Design an enzyme around this catalytic site. Structure first.
Site, PDB file in Angstrom:
ATOM      1  N   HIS A 195      -7.036  -1.726   6.122  1.00  0.00           N
ATOM      2  CA  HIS A 195      -6.106  -0.781   6.719  1.00  0.00           C
ATOM      3  C   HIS A 195      -6.066   0.471   5.844  1.00  0.00           C
ATOM      4  O   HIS A 195      -5.996   1.590   6.337  1.00  0.00           O
ATOM      5  CB  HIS A 195      -4.706  -1.395   6.854  1.00  0.00           C
ATOM      6  N   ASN A 247      -2.290   2.957  13.517  1.00  0.00           N
ATOM      7  CA  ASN A 247      -2.619   4.002  12.572  1.00  0.00           C
ATOM      8  C   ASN A 247      -3.814   3.565  11.725  1.00  0.00           C
ATOM      9  O   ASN A 247      -3.706   2.622  10.947  1.00  0.00           O
ATOM     10  CB  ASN A 247      -1.418   4.303  11.682  1.00  0.00           C
ATOM     11  N   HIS A 265       1.574   3.854   2.069  1.00  0.00           N
ATOM     12  CA  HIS A 265       2.231   4.513   3.204  1.00  0.00           C
ATOM     13  C   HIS A 265       3.744   4.262   3.197  1.00  0.00           C
ATOM     14  O   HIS A 265       4.248   3.361   2.540  1.00  0.00           O
ATOM     15  CB  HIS A 265       1.632   4.037   4.539  1.00  0.00           C
ATOM     16  N   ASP A 286       5.934   2.945   5.198  1.00  0.00           N
ATOM     17  CA  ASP A 286       6.566   1.673   5.560  1.00  0.00           C
ATOM     18  C   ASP A 286       6.544   0.703   4.386  1.00  0.00           C
ATOM     19  O   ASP A 286       7.177  -0.370   4.446  1.00  0.00           O
ATOM     20  CB  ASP A 286       5.937   1.035   6.830  1.00  0.00           C
ATOM     21  N   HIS A 299       0.838  -1.217   0.000  1.00  0.00           N
ATOM     22  CA  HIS A 299       0.000   0.000   0.000  1.00  0.00           C
ATOM     23  C   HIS A 299       0.866   1.258   0.000  1.00  0.00           C
ATOM     24  O   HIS A 299       2.100   1.174  -0.138  1.00  0.00           O
ATOM     25  CB  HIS A 299      -1.035  -0.009   1.152  1.00  0.00           C
TER      26      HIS A 299
HETATM   27  C1  LIG Z   1      -0.319   0.228  11.235  1.00  0.00           C
HETATM   28  C2  LIG Z   1       0.544   0.389   9.990  1.00  0.00           C
HETATM   29  O1  LIG Z   1       1.064  -0.584   9.491  1.00  0.00           O
HETATM   30  S1  LIG Z   1       0.658   2.002   9.248  1.00  0.00           S
HETATM   31  C3  LIG Z   1       2.111   2.546   8.453  1.00  0.00           C
HETATM   32  C4  LIG Z   1       2.598   3.540   9.468  1.00  0.00           C
HETATM   33  C5  LIG Z   1       3.368   2.767  10.528  1.00  0.00           C
HETATM   34  C6  LIG Z   1       2.549   2.503  11.786  1.00  0.00           C
HETATM   35  C7  LIG Z   1       3.200   1.391  12.572  1.00  0.00           C
HETATM   36  C8  LIG Z   1       2.437   1.105  13.853  1.00  0.00           C
HETATM   37  C9  LIG Z   1       2.279  -0.212  14.255  1.00  0.00           C
HETATM   38  C10 LIG Z   1       1.586  -0.515  15.414  1.00  0.00           C
HETATM   39  C11 LIG Z   1       1.044   0.503  16.172  1.00  0.00           C
HETATM   40  C12 LIG Z   1       1.202   1.816  15.774  1.00  0.00           C
HETATM   41  C13 LIG Z   1       1.894   2.124  14.613  1.00  0.00           C
HETATM   42  P1  LIG Z   1       3.548   4.807   8.576  1.00  0.00           P
HETATM   43  O2  LIG Z   1       4.121   4.391   7.295  1.00  0.00           O
HETATM   44  O3  LIG Z   1       2.753   6.036   8.278  1.00  0.00           O
HETATM   45  O4  LIG Z   1       4.728   5.289   9.288  1.00  0.00           O
HETATM   46 CL   LIG Z   2       2.731   7.692   4.752  1.00  0.00          CL
HETATM   47 ZN   LIG Z   3      -0.389   2.021   6.254  1.00  0.00          ZN
END
Ligand SMILES: CC(=O)SC[C@@H](CCCc1ccccc1)P(=O)(O)O
Ligand SMILES: [Cl-]
Ligand SMILES: [Zn+2]
Length: 230
Positions: A148, A179, A85, A87, A83
């Site tokens: 998600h 998130n 984002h 990560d 996706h």
């Molecule tokens: C929940 C996700 O996988 S969202 C991708 C975000 C990472 C969030 C990782 C995370 C995992 C568990 C609890 C809170 C955040 P971003 O790319 O904006 O930094």
């Molecule tokens: Cl992002």
């Molecule tokens: Zn994400």
């Protein structure tokens, strides 16, 4: 044996062998004042490797390539981002600089652009509608519907019965939806049900963050999501 967040300094990447020709990669990154682990996949594709998702940032993705070269020694020639984002696409420019052809769905590419994220070069055809699946080398790509995020893909490795859920699937210990800014909470359990029906024989399920488990991760994820809608 599966590496955990406190064990991986930011900027380092671990490889974990799931089966012959299938690895996860684990890295760590800061998000809103905390550091989180994150999983991707690596799948042997004949003499080449297929990468699923970046290691969440340019620095981490460079360490990923170096780790692959040190430990496996086959070239990554293609990468799919599941996706939009950071990560998942953060580090695509490093991949491309290293000679990797980068791919994502048209939806993921558009959303990455709007978001100001790195944009995978090539569009994956055939993933437009919930329930769509396509072959991509040694994997199947599946669009289960919005969860998600509206664009999230999952990946199945039929030769090893490995299901990679990305951020649509939570690890078993995770009780809090993280998130959910771009999530569709009403659709998420339906999208999980599609995954369940399409891959009923999956033996190993990899969430986007944390410990792999079994098909029990799907039900668990629905429970957490339904709880965060009540
Ligand atoms: C929940 C996700 O996988 S969202 C991708 C975000 C990472 C969030 C990782 C995370 C995992 C568990 C609890 C809170 C955040 P971003 O790319 O904006 O930094
Ligand atoms: Cl992002
Ligand atoms: Zn994400």
């Amino acid at each position: 044996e599966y590496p955990t967040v406190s064990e991986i300094p930011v900027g380092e990447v671990r490889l974990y062998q799931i089966a012959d020709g299938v690895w996860s990669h684990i890295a760590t990154q800061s998000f809103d004042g905390a550091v989180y682990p994150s999983n991707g996949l690596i799948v042997r594709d004949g003499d080449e490797l297929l990468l699923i998702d970046t290691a969440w940032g340019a620095k981490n993705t460079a360490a990923l390539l170096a780790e692959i070269e040190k430990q496996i020694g086959l070239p990554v020639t293609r990468a799919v981002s599941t996706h939009f984002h950071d990560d998942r696409v953060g580090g695509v420019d490093v991949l491309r600089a290293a000679g990797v052809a980068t791919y994502a769905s048209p939806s993921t590419r558009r959303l990455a652009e709007v978001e100001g994220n790195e944009i995978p070069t090539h569009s994956l055809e055939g993933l437009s509608s919930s329930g769509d699946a396509v072959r991509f080398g040694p994997v199947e790509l599946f669009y289960p519907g919005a969860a998600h995020s509206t664009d999230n893909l999952v990946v199945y490795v039929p030769s090893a019965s490995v299901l990679y859920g990305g951020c649509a699937i939570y690890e078993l210990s995770r009780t809090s939806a993280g998130n959910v800014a771009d999530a569709d909470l009403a659709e998420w359990p339906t999208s999980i049900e599609r995954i369940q029906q399409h891959y009923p024989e999956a033996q190993f399920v990899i969430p986007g963050h944390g410990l792999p488990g079994g098909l029990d991760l799907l039900k668990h994820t629905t429970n957490v999501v339904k709880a965060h809608t009540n």
